[PDB]
Amino acid sequence: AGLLEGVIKEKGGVPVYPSYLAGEWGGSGQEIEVKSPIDLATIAKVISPSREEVERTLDVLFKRGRWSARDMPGTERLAVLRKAADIIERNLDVFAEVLVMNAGKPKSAAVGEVKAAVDRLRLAELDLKKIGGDYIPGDWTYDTLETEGLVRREPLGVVAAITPFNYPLFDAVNKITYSFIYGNAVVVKPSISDPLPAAMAVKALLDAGFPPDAIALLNLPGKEAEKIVADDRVAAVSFTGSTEVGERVVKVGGVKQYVMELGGGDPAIVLEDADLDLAADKIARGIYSYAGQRCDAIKLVLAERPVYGKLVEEVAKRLSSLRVGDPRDPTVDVGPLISPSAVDEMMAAIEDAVEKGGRVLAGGRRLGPTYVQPTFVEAPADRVKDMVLYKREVFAPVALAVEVKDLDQAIELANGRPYGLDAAVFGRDVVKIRRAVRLLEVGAIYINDMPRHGIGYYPFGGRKKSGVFREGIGYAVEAVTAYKTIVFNYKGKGVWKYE
Amino acid sequence: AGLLEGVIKEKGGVPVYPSYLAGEWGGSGQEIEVKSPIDLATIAKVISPSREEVERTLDVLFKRGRWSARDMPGTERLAVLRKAADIIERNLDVFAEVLVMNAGKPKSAAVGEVKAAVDRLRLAELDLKKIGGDYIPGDWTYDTLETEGLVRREPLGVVAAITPFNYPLFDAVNKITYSFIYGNAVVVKPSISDPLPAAMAVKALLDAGFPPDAIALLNLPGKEAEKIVADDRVAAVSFTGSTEVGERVVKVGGVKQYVMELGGGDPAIVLEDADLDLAADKIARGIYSYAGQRCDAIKLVLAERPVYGKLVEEVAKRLSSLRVGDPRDPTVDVGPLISPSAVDEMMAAIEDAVEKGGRVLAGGRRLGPTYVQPTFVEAPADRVKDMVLYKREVFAPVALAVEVKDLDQAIELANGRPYGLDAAVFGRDVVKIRRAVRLLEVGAIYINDMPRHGIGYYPFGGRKKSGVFREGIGYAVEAVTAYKTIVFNYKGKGVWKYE
Amino acid sequence: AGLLEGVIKEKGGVPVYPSYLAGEWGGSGQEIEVKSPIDLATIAKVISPSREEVERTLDVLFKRGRWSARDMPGTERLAVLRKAADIIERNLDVFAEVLVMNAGKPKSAAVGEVKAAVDRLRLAELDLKKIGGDYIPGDWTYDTLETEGLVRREPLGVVAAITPFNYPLFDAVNKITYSFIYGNAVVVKPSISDPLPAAMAVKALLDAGFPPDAIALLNLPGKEAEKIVADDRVAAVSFTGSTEVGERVVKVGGVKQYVMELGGGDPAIVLEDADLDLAADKIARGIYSYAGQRCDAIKLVLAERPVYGKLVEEVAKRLSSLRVGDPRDPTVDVGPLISPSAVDEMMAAIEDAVEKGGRVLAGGRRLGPTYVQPTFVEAPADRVKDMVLYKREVFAPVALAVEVKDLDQAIELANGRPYGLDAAVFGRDVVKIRRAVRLLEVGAIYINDMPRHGIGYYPFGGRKKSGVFREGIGYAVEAVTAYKTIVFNYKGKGVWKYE
Amino acid sequence: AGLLEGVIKEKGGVPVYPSYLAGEWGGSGQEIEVKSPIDLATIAKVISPSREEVERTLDVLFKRGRWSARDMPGTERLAVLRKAADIIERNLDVFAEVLVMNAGKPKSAAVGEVKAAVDRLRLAELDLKKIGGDYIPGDWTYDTLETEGLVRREPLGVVAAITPFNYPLFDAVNKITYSFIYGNAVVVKPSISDPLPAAMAVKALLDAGFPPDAIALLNLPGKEAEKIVADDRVAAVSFTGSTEVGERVVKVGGVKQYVMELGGGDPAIVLEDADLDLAADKIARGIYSYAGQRCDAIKLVLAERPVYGKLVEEVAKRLSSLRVGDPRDPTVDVGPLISPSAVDEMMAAIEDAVEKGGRVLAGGRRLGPTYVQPTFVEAPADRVKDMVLYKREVFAPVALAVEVKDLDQAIELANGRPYGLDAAVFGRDVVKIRRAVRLLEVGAIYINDMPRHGIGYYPFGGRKKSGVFREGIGYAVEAVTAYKTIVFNYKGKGVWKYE
Ligand SMILES: NC(=O)c1ccc[n+]([C@@H]2O[C@H](COP(=O)([O-])OP(=O)(O)OC[C@H]3O[C@@H](n4cnc5c(N)ncnc54)[C@H](OP(=O)(O)O)[C@@H]3O)[C@@H](O)[C@H]2O)c1
Ligand code: NA
Ligand code: NA
Ligand code: NA
Ligand code: NA
């Protein structure tokens, strides 16, 4: 709309969003309905590309896109990204509305995501802190005497950005930004569930000057994307999604550069010396934000005996005083879950917990096909480990609360889930904190705050089932870039005199 | 022998080498014969572990090895590696003999490899140049104000080191070194073809004090190793081998940290201003060393019109004046190829070349089941691209020679193979060299020298089919280590006053 | 004017520019006339501060400025600098006019300097590439086991920026930028010769939001500034000027953090394989730009026998075809020298050269008190070393030309001057270039281009008499920042288990 | 002795140690007596060099030493340093004895210093972590498009190492190590008070293979050394000593690279949540070690109301139960102070404290010309600031104890001394610690441990009157090295296609 005026086709009353085929918007594959979790109604349709168009798109990205991206100097790439930030920023309300509608994201969250996307774009300048190369003098070994080395980063070529439904706008902009800033072409494949924000972002980027043949947006459902991942013209795959799909992706892709942000939930530990007001507030928010549909959502709360009571009490109060419903109301604190299935699973997971000795301390009530109350289930340490809510990631606003004797048990229980994305620790004692930081097997630990990846100012990523590699300003360079070593031989050439 | 006095079992006149099961040498799986390429005779047997022992070994590595390695401070780890270097160095002749016998490596090459292994071990101190972490101040964004970050490296746990036959000693020592120096446990799986050097190295390491439950040596043939790669207790897989196996490995392994050094050959470019004496000498050596059974061997020579003649002439002379035969003779320049099959393929590849317009300029004569002459086949640019020797990696002492008009054609032809490991460029003009460095799609470019990874003083690794990620002193940290981000929240705590 | 509407006082027909006293513009010290080199006419007056005001200003900078600068978060500091860039950019013509008038800078050079200042301000974001700190794990030594270190950069406090006359605008903006971006307060002391551009820049910065008590502009003549340098509240002194004053500054300042950019000229070497069109063009420009009043101006040209003739011929032609005169004419290539004295010295230096066997190849004619022709004096290698033009820096558009047998003699002669700022080398052979790069004792070597510090995209600074330390985007952090090491002791605390 | 068998001359019953003149041991200047603080008796004599020999030595260091050091490859330099470590280690008892005798250092401290020197030498390998250079791509600005930069470190040439009396062995070995590892020649000028350990170290280095013309040991008293510092052949001055001499050194030296470690004492802060056993123990030791003749000695103890009593009580007990006397007795905890003057000043400083309201809590008794008891003087916050013990550095085992209300007052009082070397903070709360770390104006803060520079595993150095720049493994490179920037111009050369 406006930004997409010439792109969208209103066929039979429903806006039809086409795929961007590295040059022209189009697509002659099956059309797919995009629905809102707010009312299960179809709000648009996306045109998937045919196998022939996928193939043609990859060919363009590979034969020309790599070069258009690479041959645009960084100073210009930065201008493109800054311009795109401006376009998105002036179309903020439009971007947010689509997030609220297409993702069921509360207005404030949708606005925050648009702003995150804008900031990410504007701070592409900070990604340069990890851009320089290394100069290795060769006289520190006899075999390399009169020799010298230069190690540089080079873009890999075509990066496939596969994105999840819970951050349809930001994830796509983030991956495109760090992939492009370093000189790569990019194939974005958004969740077929809410692909509208990506289409809007890609349009803003194209309007900003992004090399037209260096980007592609393909509306392909699940396994249709395998064809992209398995293709040799795709040198890297930046994937943010579930562990299970991530696994399938690597198995389909084979040898290639990967960044796998596979989520799972996050445990939060509260030491006896923690500021419980701060802790309860951050933990409650960590549990419910975007209806827990955040990879960094809190799924397990571990608190030492002496503060467990108050802490769990406060979090319960906070979760209970939340307003659920339609996200269009800036009154609502919690909108719907992406699908009735996600709610089904959450309900089943809560029953499992209750059956295994668990007790609901807040929530528990399903309010409709896609609506539920943020639930907080207490569980005894000796039984929690077998609970579905512990063993798995229930993508919903639901967390377990478990009282623990001391730090070692908290740590042990925190490390007992199969995931290792982030962990939170509230407390003040440097020694206990240092111990926790050392022993928690996670990509990131947040001291005195809820886990929040934000725009990646600080790098993040998983351990164990949560994946491999990191995303972040500067650090993402490792996933979309390859080193290039140049060794110079001056043996006997008179540069050095035996040294 | 001596180092392995209590380990090896002389059963029926043939030394029987057992697997090391992270604690004790043993194995109750099938026994497998190890033969010498020098005479196709069985020189020993290795005991493969049973499925039960593989499983038990992994369990030990995971439950205890990770901790024994990690909980040994770096200063002690360095002492272990230095001690191991001493043990290997005093047993040099024994190490070299086994290389000559088991791998068919010429005496000087076998001695050089033992020395490379010793140096690698002693320079583990240089790997620390990439060990420190990053401190990220948070006041460069509003959302992160009064926040701070620490980014650190942490060992992944259990690294599976899969090694090729062409550098049985060094590769195993290299992977063990960089995996261990950072605190990881390691499962070494050597080529079942020549696993004796690894067994000797692992023994020297164990004698040096390497945590007995933090290392394992498993004599498993090909697909028997899949069980290790596919296991979740294996957090990283450092693989050096062929593209095809590398592909299978990732597909079996799924999401995990990988370093894939997949070889392929290397092209060498000679500019009109090159010192042709240096070039011919380095190129000849690059073609024949260890009977071309080097991932960094020269497989294609591209020379500009004006020097093509002399260059190809000189390389031909040099290859022709080489002494082939048994590697025990310090007289021999070239020993045998690892198997009669490898020679078969080389012969077939030479015929293919000849049929497509190629002309042998040196060699071409097979001298026995496992012996051949270093061959240099000239080919016209317009036909070389379809030749098996160009399209594939023929692991043998054989290279193609192709005359080219200019740098652009040399570069184009060099980039036309499916591999991108290293490339060599002989010439003096900075501009032409810089252009070549920019356009050659390889992990490493050697200016005025033949490609030689050495001990990894300079990082190396592939592009395209040659794999992903790099190995090298300092740089290998990226493959066996994961980042850990710790974010500290001091918002409103009075550390800063709005800043 | 406009930007300075409320600041400047028109007393007796001459605009009177007051000093900025870290809070308010003013000054009750002697008034000093500012003249134009274009016509020796007084174009303005500057009010110097009294001893009491200097003292009061320092007190404010120290007691409040350090904190205003430091307590403004970086994100805001960046906004200030970007805003200042905008203000200067919209007032470009006004900034340039003052440069042309006050410095005698040709219009295109004055415009280029304003743009350099604007870019420097906008790229302050790139200075962050060197901002993070280091995390040092402690288990690599026994004495530091269970210990850990964090190394961070911290602003020093009050940086005294002393600037030269030849880049009155840029130098002041550069020093203020890198000093401020890291959290320092700044006392700018411009050349009393052309202090108007600094006053304008400081006003733009104040209008942009620069903490009013964190900056000071003091119009003090020469030794009046010693009082600032010698003060203990001044933690660092960023000085760009002559060797002799630089020496006096350190001797007055004593222990303190220093960056001393002390110029001197630069030698240029032309190898036999150099593109002589490029060389002659760049060298000619390097000799005459801003009437040679550039620290990086070419003062000596060394060319190998085979190209000496053509090279010197071409440079002579180019210097001869230059238009001298008043800088207001966009027709003029060369304006006047800052003072009649500077011309006197140049004439004397040319006579000295001629007397010692030197021969003028272009120029030599003085055209007025402050006007002269760009002069190129040929000199025999065996006599040049004793020539004033070689031994000293004659700040004027004058260079010596000396034929040399080979690289070694060029290098020897290039290193024979007492300075070591930059050096230029035109040629293509990597070996000769590498040798030159190794042996030239200078802070920076420019391959195939004239020396040009630009905005410091690449760090620069001197060796020998040219000073110490470097300025540059990112690198200047070392001069206005101090490290802060935090060592954490966890011995026996149970974080690690013997490691 | 033994190591110095052919060097030392027994003239008139007293061993006569000559200076090392970059080639030969000798000296024809005045002879100077070296006395022991243990009994004021002359234990040896040192021959100072004549003005002619100083001049000749500098000439050798400059004309040949720079090259011998630089032209010895790093791999060999490392071998020299490792060999020297071996020589010193096998002569440990001899090295320690001279420390005990010449410096009055307790046996355990003397042994610890020899070991520190040995370790420093062996870990020279860790200094390489800061040796590589930077590669700066040029397409991030329009003016630098098609341009590229390489930034490298280069040795400065001749480094003058001026050392203090309190660590005669280590300081000399440290400065020589970091100066030499990077390729510099070195003039060591030890305290004329105890120059014997330096002579022994220099001999071990020469025996180890240290280029004979790249090192010099000059026995010059105080201002005789100015001649070295003021010389232009001296590119850097690494000085560890008092603020006042440091000031004189820079004023004599002028523009040059400096590292000024100017000591002063260190304050220690004890928060209410500190482990007081650890604190009292570390603080007591920090106060008395080597009779407080440590730049990092604790001179001021600040403790919050609630723990002040116990803390000061415990430290008093510990200081009181110390055994003073002759250092030869391994029984003694505290030997003598370097001179009767140092004791005089300490006594006067204690009286001043008492007169201003201070009360001795331990010690106070002078036991002889050079012996005293470790003294702990309590002082009220409102009067301490004017006490000599606070305002100055009394180089003796004496510290002030001051009770404080909270962290802010502790910090304020800690920052009130004119020095800023290190500071110690005992406590557990992360927020209070972070605040302290931010506000303490010192080069280094030690959390939960006494300040101990050790061998510089962690970098250290001063703020304010404590000097400028840092020493440390890796970090010292900045003081004895200069950057060298090489900019390559490929504009229009076809390397890049507009990028
Ligand atoms: N890129 C580099 O830096 C580099 C360096 C050296 C060599 N190379 C390349 O690697 C090859 C070396 O020779 P190679 O013949 O030994 O090649 P390879 O067969 O690919 O070596 C494979 C290694 O993987 C094991 N393996 C085989 N199938 C496996 C499977 N299905 N699952 C798990 N592991 C399996 C092999 O054991 P078995 O021996 O039991 O089959 C062997 O240890 C050449 O192509 C060379 O160019 C590359
Ligand atoms: Na694949
Ligand atoms: Na897997
Ligand atoms: Na001073
Ligand atoms: Na001087």
JSON list of C-alpha atoms in Angstrom, two decimals, chain B residues 215-285:
[
{"chain": "B", "resi": 215, "resn": "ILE", "atom": "CA", "xyz": [40.90, -38.28, 23.65]},
{"chain": "B", "resi": 216, "resn": "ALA", "atom": "CA", "xyz": [39.86, -41.26, 21.58]},
{"chain": "B", "resi": 217, "resn": "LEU", "atom": "CA", "xyz": [41.30, -42.92, 18.51]},
{"chain": "B", "resi": 218, "resn": "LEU", "atom": "CA", "xyz": [38.79, -45.05, 16.65]},
{"chain": "B", "resi": 219, "resn": "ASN", "atom": "CA", "xyz": [39.81, -47.32, 13.78]},
{"chain": "B", "resi": 220, "resn": "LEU", "atom": "CA", "xyz": [36.52, -47.27, 11.91]},
{"chain": "B", "resi": 221, "resn": "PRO", "atom": "CA", "xyz": [36.24, -47.73, 8.18]},
{"chain": "B", "resi": 222, "resn": "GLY", "atom": "CA", "xyz": [34.34, -45.11, 6.17]},
{"chain": "B", "resi": 223, "resn": "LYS", "atom": "CA", "xyz": [30.62, -45.22, 6.95]},
{"chain": "B", "resi": 224, "resn": "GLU", "atom": "CA", "xyz": [31.28, -46.79, 10.35]},
{"chain": "B", "resi": 225, "resn": "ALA", "atom": "CA", "xyz": [32.34, -43.28, 11.33]},
{"chain": "B", "resi": 226, "resn": "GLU", "atom": "CA", "xyz": [28.93, -41.83, 10.46]},
{"chain": "B", "resi": 227, "resn": "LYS", "atom": "CA", "xyz": [27.74, -43.05, 13.85]},
{"chain": "B", "resi": 228, "resn": "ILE", "atom": "CA", "xyz": [30.21, -40.58, 15.42]},
{"chain": "B", "resi": 229, "resn": "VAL", "atom": "CA", "xyz": [29.43, -37.62, 13.18]},
{"chain": "B", "resi": 230, "resn": "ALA", "atom": "CA", "xyz": [25.66, -38.03, 13.63]},
{"chain": "B", "resi": 231, "resn": "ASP", "atom": "CA", "xyz": [25.88, -38.14, 17.40]},
{"chain": "B", "resi": 232, "resn": "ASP", "atom": "CA", "xyz": [24.65, -35.16, 19.41]},
{"chain": "B", "resi": 233, "resn": "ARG", "atom": "CA", "xyz": [27.49, -35.44, 21.88]},
{"chain": "B", "resi": 234, "resn": "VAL", "atom": "CA", "xyz": [29.71, -34.37, 18.98]},
{"chain": "B", "resi": 235, "resn": "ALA", "atom": "CA", "xyz": [29.52, -30.56, 18.87]},
{"chain": "B", "resi": 236, "resn": "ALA", "atom": "CA", "xyz": [31.99, -30.04, 16.04]},
{"chain": "B", "resi": 237, "resn": "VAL", "atom": "CA", "xyz": [33.41, -31.94, 13.14]},
{"chain": "B", "resi": 238, "resn": "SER", "atom": "CA", "xyz": [36.83, -31.02, 11.75]},
{"chain": "B", "resi": 239, "resn": "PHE", "atom": "CA", "xyz": [37.00, -32.88, 8.46]},
{"chain": "B", "resi": 240, "resn": "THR", "atom": "CA", "xyz": [39.75, -32.94, 5.89]},
{"chain": "B", "resi": 241, "resn": "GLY", "atom": "CA", "xyz": [38.98, -35.22, 2.96]},
{"chain": "B", "resi": 242, "resn": "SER", "atom": "CA", "xyz": [37.17, -35.35, -0.39]},
{"chain": "B", "resi": 243, "resn": "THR", "atom": "CA", "xyz": [34.23, -33.15, -1.34]},
{"chain": "B", "resi": 244, "resn": "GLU", "atom": "CA", "xyz": [31.93, -36.13, -1.72]},
{"chain": "B", "resi": 245, "resn": "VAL", "atom": "CA", "xyz": [32.61, -37.54, 1.74]},
{"chain": "B", "resi": 246, "resn": "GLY", "atom": "CA", "xyz": [32.49, -34.07, 3.24]},
{"chain": "B", "resi": 247, "resn": "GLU", "atom": "CA", "xyz": [28.99, -33.67, 1.80]},
{"chain": "B", "resi": 248, "resn": "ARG", "atom": "CA", "xyz": [27.88, -36.98, 3.28]},
{"chain": "B", "resi": 249, "resn": "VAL", "atom": "CA", "xyz": [29.36, -35.97, 6.63]},
{"chain": "B", "resi": 250, "resn": "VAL", "atom": "CA", "xyz": [27.36, -32.76, 6.93]},
{"chain": "B", "resi": 251, "resn": "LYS", "atom": "CA", "xyz": [24.20, -34.54, 5.77]},
{"chain": "B", "resi": 252, "resn": "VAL", "atom": "CA", "xyz": [24.72, -37.18, 8.44]},
{"chain": "B", "resi": 253, "resn": "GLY", "atom": "CA", "xyz": [25.79, -34.64, 11.05]},
{"chain": "B", "resi": 254, "resn": "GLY", "atom": "CA", "xyz": [23.12, -31.98, 10.56]},
{"chain": "B", "resi": 255, "resn": "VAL", "atom": "CA", "xyz": [23.42, -28.76, 12.60]},
{"chain": "B", "resi": 256, "resn": "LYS", "atom": "CA", "xyz": [26.85, -28.55, 14.14]},
{"chain": "B", "resi": 257, "resn": "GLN", "atom": "CA", "xyz": [30.07, -26.52, 13.94]},
{"chain": "B", "resi": 258, "resn": "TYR", "atom": "CA", "xyz": [32.10, -27.66, 10.88]},
{"chain": "B", "resi": 259, "resn": "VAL", "atom": "CA", "xyz": [35.45, -27.05, 9.27]},
{"chain": "B", "resi": 260, "resn": "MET", "atom": "CA", "xyz": [35.49, -28.75, 5.89]},
{"chain": "B", "resi": 261, "resn": "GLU", "atom": "CA", "xyz": [38.85, -28.79, 4.14]},
{"chain": "B", "resi": 262, "resn": "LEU", "atom": "CA", "xyz": [37.82, -30.56, 0.93]},
{"chain": "B", "resi": 263, "resn": "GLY", "atom": "CA", "xyz": [40.85, -30.05, -1.29]},
{"chain": "B", "resi": 264, "resn": "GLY", "atom": "CA", "xyz": [40.63, -30.39, -5.06]},
{"chain": "B", "resi": 265, "resn": "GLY", "atom": "CA", "xyz": [43.69, -29.25, -6.88]},
{"chain": "B", "resi": 266, "resn": "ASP", "atom": "CA", "xyz": [45.22, -25.82, -7.26]},
{"chain": "B", "resi": 267, "resn": "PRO", "atom": "CA", "xyz": [45.86, -23.79, -10.42]},
{"chain": "B", "resi": 268, "resn": "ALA", "atom": "CA", "xyz": [49.11, -21.85, -10.85]},
{"chain": "B", "resi": 269, "resn": "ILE", "atom": "CA", "xyz": [49.32, -18.72, -12.99]},
{"chain": "B", "resi": 270, "resn": "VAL", "atom": "CA", "xyz": [52.49, -17.41, -14.52]},
{"chain": "B", "resi": 271, "resn": "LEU", "atom": "CA", "xyz": [52.55, -13.81, -15.66]},
{"chain": "B", "resi": 272, "resn": "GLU", "atom": "CA", "xyz": [54.93, -12.63, -18.35]},
{"chain": "B", "resi": 273, "resn": "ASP", "atom": "CA", "xyz": [57.12, -10.89, -15.79]},
{"chain": "B", "resi": 274, "resn": "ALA", "atom": "CA", "xyz": [57.58, -13.93, -13.56]},
{"chain": "B", "resi": 275, "resn": "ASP", "atom": "CA", "xyz": [61.00, -15.27, -12.62]},
{"chain": "B", "resi": 276, "resn": "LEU", "atom": "CA", "xyz": [60.60, -18.48, -14.65]},
{"chain": "B", "resi": 277, "resn": "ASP", "atom": "CA", "xyz": [63.38, -20.35, -12.79]},
{"chain": "B", "resi": 278, "resn": "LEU", "atom": "CA", "xyz": [61.56, -19.86, -9.53]},
{"chain": "B", "resi": 279, "resn": "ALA", "atom": "CA", "xyz": [58.22, -20.58, -11.20]},
{"chain": "B", "resi": 280, "resn": "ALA", "atom": "CA", "xyz": [59.25, -23.79, -12.98]},
{"chain": "B", "resi": 281, "resn": "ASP", "atom": "CA", "xyz": [61.00, -25.09, -9.88]},
{"chain": "B", "resi": 282, "resn": "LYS", "atom": "CA", "xyz": [58.06, -24.37, -7.54]},
{"chain": "B", "resi": 283, "resn": "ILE", "atom": "CA", "xyz": [55.49, -25.56, -10.06]},
{"chain": "B", "resi": 284, "resn": "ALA", "atom": "CA", "xyz": [57.30, -28.84, -10.77]},
{"chain": "B", "resi": 285, "resn": "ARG", "atom": "CA", "xyz": [57.54, -29.46, -7.04]}
]
